Symmetry: C3
Subunit: 278 residues, 3 copies
């Protein structure tokens, strides 16, 4: 496929927090276009992102990010006066760095990985109301040379829902056999979960794939996660197994039974999915 380049660009983007239907709340890149989860932010190690944020809502909101470099004034917490009053604006700055050798011979780990942002002030000073309402989104930081996927799908286990959706309503994702598909998997709220995919597996490391025959990372199809965990992987759709409606679900038994299930709909080249009948 493609390969991520070396980073180092200074980037800008506008972001809004807005109310959505039925007490929900979401982030968006354009007014009236908020979504749960929020827009995918992608950066290359070295990039700087200035987020020109605006709160269109009637209550304070903030933007807090995992993993990336930010100064304390972009913490997005009320305690550090980094929240945004109703109608207010503020520029959050996120920075990223390459790995490299420190002066003392140690190895500084880079920014790359599967990360996320979310509100930190709605409902409580820890964003408990903001997370419930839908104020979360994925951030991917790529290392130079990372393979780029054909498509990227974000799955958020938010309490007992997926992406704040009604029970038993997916979401479903479509691919064709051989597609390189990237899953970003984020958890929020109160519960632990176990994320599981039928017919596909991945390595429990940074990229979700073994670096080669010297990489001892476990290969899994079932992963325990809890509030604010994030991980990701790339799989080849239908590799070794073929086309079909491949279930993904939380494997906590009452959780799948109550509707934390969706489908990885993998099609043959002719567009068919053998045996699928919803």
């Amino acid at each position: 496929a493609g390969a991520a380049p070396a980073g180092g660009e200074v980037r800008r983007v506008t972001m809004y927090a807005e109310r959505l239907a039925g007490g929900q709340m979401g982030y968006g890149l354009e007014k009236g276009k908020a979504s749960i989860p929020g827009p995918l932010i992608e950066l290359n190690e070295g990039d700087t992102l200035h987020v020109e944020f605006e709160n269109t809502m009637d209550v304070p909101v903030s933007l807090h990010v995992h993993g990336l470099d930010y100064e304390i004034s972009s913490d997005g917490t009320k305690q550090n006066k980094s929240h945004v009053e109703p109608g207010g604006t503020r520029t959050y700055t996120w920075r990223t760095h390459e790995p490299g050798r420190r002066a003392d011979g140690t190895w500084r780990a880079g920014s790359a990985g599967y990360w996320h942002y979310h509100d930190h002030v709605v409902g409580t000073e820890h964003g408990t109301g903001g997370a419930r309402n839908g104020l979360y989104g994925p951030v991917i930081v790529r290392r130079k040379g990372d393979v780029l996927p054909d498509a990227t799908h974000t799955i958020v286990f938010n309490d007992m829902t997926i992406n704040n959706r009604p029970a038993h309503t997916g979401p479903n994702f479509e691919a064709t056999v051989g597609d390189r598909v990237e899953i970003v998997m984020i958890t929020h709220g109160e519960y632990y979960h176990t994320f599981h995919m039928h017919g596909h597996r991945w390595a429990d490391n940074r990229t979700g794939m073994l670096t080669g025959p010297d990489d001892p990372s476990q290969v899994i199809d079932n992963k325990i996660c809890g509030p604010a965990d994030s991980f990701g992987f790339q799989i080849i759709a239908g590799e070794g197994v073929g086309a079909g409606a491949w279930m993904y679900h939380c494997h906590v038994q009452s959780h799948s039974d109550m509707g934390m299930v969706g489908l990885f709909l993998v099609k043959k080249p002719d567009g068919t999915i053998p045996g699928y009948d919803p």
Copy 2:
């Protein structure tokens, strides 16, 4: 003793789902011989396994496997009509592959690992009643060169039970100091747990053993696990610690207090276990 050879053979096994005493259900390789946990299935990477499956019960049942390759017709779900009606039969096919490089340059991970199979249709569309009743078992897929154990033991944290056994009834496993002992650990149901072993430790990687001095995997004696998690390891029994009645238990405090505990009985060569009074462990 020994090492795993290269896979590539086409293997076949018969499997039966059967009701067992106490309202339980289990899988077995021979009729009337079901067990909880189900029979240990071991394959070498590259092997194919045809499972000739018969449901001897009055309710639909299925066979769903983690980790291994299978086409959608062997998914073992009602939704894809790969369940088995009462009294019915079906052949499930599991395949496995060796690691290698893709044309796009990336590494395709092999199937090797500590995996497991279980029912997917008893009680609910996700097998909630089936796993609770005992329809679960272990699958080990070995990579060429993997070290082989002197014995393999399977420990399943199924809800608040170990292997569906009553509280404070084990199971216990015996070995002799120096034995290479393999543990397969699987979790099912509703609850997270933490598996702990006294006197022994393992690496948090595929085999549970470090490859050599360049493996940075954390070495642990306590591992959080949730429903359908599976991992495994090998330990040298008593290595650097000696014989004795070595406890394993869930380390969630109320869980150990309520009976999620067992004993790794490591014997001296003369068959004796120092300091082991069984009634003091009751």
Copy 3:
């Protein structure tokens, strides 16, 4: 600095003592018990004989994770190595280096972030003892391991941090650029997720990537359950600057009900802007 090779036989006295408010703790001298207990540090190959005294009116024990101990140092009533009220016992912990065995396999060393705790107070798995505060960290270093400028232990004990009242920390101070080591232990009934604002670490033995070839995930959030232990080292404020950097359990209601603390990273002049 860097860790030397181990191999020394050490001795130390340890006491179990009642503390205020129904609590209990370990200490190295009488009247100096603390929660969490004293940090025990060893180099792979060291032996530690713990000369243990129970100054309490109820039986107590000492049980350790990860280190090599014979069955007589199990610290369990079940194997009769608990300590009656007023009694004394010597517990012996050993450690070893990694190396190749005869069969050709690689024997894992003792090095890592581990912990000790009681096994007999309240129940025969020490449920009361952990709750009351009988726990503490153990670090076993491999030769050449980087040494930190300071070490702080964070224990998530049920819904508390280090048995502290809700929302009262503990707070830890550092200066921008300090090499700070965290030992993170969990006890009790609940799973948690440990999170630090402004910093990240590697999910491996040392919390540091060995170099460009280590594929471990870099994380700032980690799920942990009872008796899990892990540790890491971070450069305080590296790339982010001074500030009152929050750490907390990320299970939402847990941070709301008290599992929050501050990593107070100062400028070289000792000030924290905006705090």
